């Protein structure tokens, strides 16, 4: 499956793509404002994610740091990124269908649209100004809006027991972005797409 990753932000981002125990494609790349990077994701990929990283530095070997979304200090991510990270999440070719969503469970850094480029389903978007409106207690000094699990490490926010409800913090994310997951047991906003669809992830889709 192809994923075209487009940076419409006015700032550079370092895109990342991983399934947690391996890179997807090259796993990461710089995207200056307006640039597009097309990756190939193996059919059947379960639990893949794409995200943006901000304010990165990398040496000539591909080692460094990012303020949001850092994946073990690598340009080429093989692991998931450090919160806060807006997440484009997907599982492909699962009993004949693909499943996509956007999640704020690991916080928010960059607005994104995640849409199919082929027929048969619809896209999802989280493009509100979550960083600007972020509750004071969730603001990440390094940039972004942390989720409450990251900040407070409670069973309730982290849904550790498999029992949890919505919270004031989850409701903030949900109010700004109804079409993204706000906590683990949120009413699902997953979209079912035809198996083997192709996609576009756009950072800063509206500005």
Residue numbers in the entry: 1 to 207
What does the paper say about this structure?
The intensely sweet taste of thaumatin has been widely used not only as a natural sweetener, but also as a flavor enhancer and for masking unpleasant tastes in the food and pharmaceutical industries. Site-directed mutagenesis studies revealed that six lysine residues of Lys19, Lys49, Lys67, Lys106, Lys163, and Lys187, and three arginine residues of Arg76, Arg79, and Arg82 located on the cleft-containing side are responsible for sweetness, and two amino acids residues, Lys67 and Arg82, are particularly important for sweetness. In the present study, three mutant X-ray crystallographic structures of thaumatin (K78A, K106A, and K137A) were determined at resolutions of 1.07, 1.07 and 1.01 Å, respectively.
The B-factors of the main-chain and side-chain of mutated residue Ala78 were 19.64 and 28.49 Å2, respectively. The normalized B-factor ratio (B-factor of residue/Average B-factor) of this residue was 1.63 for main-chain and 1.55 for side-chain. The normalized B-factor ratio was reduced 0.65 for side-chain, suggesting that the flexibility of the position of the mutated site of 78 seemed to decrease. Compared to recombinant thaumatin, the blue color of the mutated site of K78A dramatically changed and the volume of the side-chain was almost lost. In our interaction model, two flexible residues, i.e., Lys78 and Lys137 interacted with the sweet receptor within 5.0 Å.
